[PDB]
């Protein structure tokens, strides 16, 4: 539908080639590890709390 | 009056001194009224957790 329609010279093909040859930047977490470590530390703190109690 | 035969006075004084300043007071000092039992069912401050 885009080759049999556009009258420009191969513009469909190179535009969509850039599309099918494009790397979109995948976002990265950078945040789950810190909250996981915080959770571990709190687990420690309240484990000793419950031991005392 | 016989209350004035002042040759029998010591034998009336001294046993009174005993029984009033020593024996009755010891008989009292062994009478003690304990304070009433006040079982406070509310004595709990432990804490929350650190959070």
Would the CB atoms of A49 and B49 count as touching at under 8 Å?
yes
DSSP character string of B2-51? GGG-TTSSHHHHHHHHHIIIIIHHHHHHT---PPPP---S----------
Q: Where are the beta strands (DSSP E) in chain A?
A: none
Q: Which residues of chain A does B46 touch, with a Cβ-Cβ cutoff of 8 Å?
A: 53
Q: What is the Cα A6 distance to its own chain's centre?
A: 35
């Amino acid at each position: 539908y885009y080759k049999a329609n556009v009258a420009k010279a191969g513009l469909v093909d190179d535009f969509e080639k850039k599309f099918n040859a494009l790397k979109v930047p995948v976002p990265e977490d950078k945040y789950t590890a810190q909250v996981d470590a915080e959770e571990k530390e709190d687990v420690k703190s309240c484990a000793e709390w419950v031991s005392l109690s | 009056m016989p209350q004035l035969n002042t040759t029998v006075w010591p034998t009336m004084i001294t046993p009174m001194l005993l029984t009033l300043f020593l024996i009755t007071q010891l008989k009292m000092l062994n009478t003690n009224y304990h304070l009433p039992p006040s079982p406070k069912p509310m004595k709990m401050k432990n804490y929350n957790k650190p959070w």
